[PDB]
Amino acid sequence: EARPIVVGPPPPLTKDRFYLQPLPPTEAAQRAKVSASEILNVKQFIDRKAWPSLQNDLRLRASYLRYDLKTVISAKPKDEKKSLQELTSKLFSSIDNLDHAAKIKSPTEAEKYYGQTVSNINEVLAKLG
Numbered sequence: 001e002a003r004p005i006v007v008g009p010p011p012p013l014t015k016d017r018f019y020l021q022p023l024p025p026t027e028a029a030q031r032a033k034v035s036a037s038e039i040l041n042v043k044q045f046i047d048r049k050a051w052p053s054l055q056n057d058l059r060l061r062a063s064y065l066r067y068d069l070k071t072v073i074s075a076k077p078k079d080e081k082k083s084l085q086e087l088t089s090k091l092f093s094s095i096d097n098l099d100h101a102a103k104i105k106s107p108t109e110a111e112k113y114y115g116q117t118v119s120n121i122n123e124v125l126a127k128l129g
């Protein structure tokens with residue numbers, strides 16, 4: 001839940017937590033794209049009011065994305081880092097708010113924050129290319 005346990009990375013080329021292996025920038029960007037797609041697949045949980053399922057899935061995706069986007073930003077050119085970091089921060093705010101909506105079992109807030117998350121994912125994907 002929210003914060004993952006970081007396990008050892010591949011060589012160079014606790015209760016209720018997910019596990020994360022750090023990846024190199026190229027592999028991190030690919031994993032980010034996957035995790036983004038998976039986030040948008042939580043709509044099924046919102047519609048069926050499956051709140052724990054929504055929270056657990058979202059937390060797994062958010063755990064990877066947060067880490068992977070940091071990795072990606074670190075390898076980007078100086079002149080591109082701040083924009084991607086702002087887009088990423090906005091995305092995490094909407095993800096955190098969607099989690100919040102699930103905690104309080106609010107369909108209206110969940111739909112609101114899911115809609116924002118769609119837009120925010122798209123902006124990040126456009127930078128990843």
Ligand SMILES: [Zn+2]
Nearest residue numbers: 043046047111
């Ligand atoms: Zn819906």
Ligand SMILES: [Zn+2]
Nearest residue numbers: 100101104109
């Ligand atoms: Zn609220």
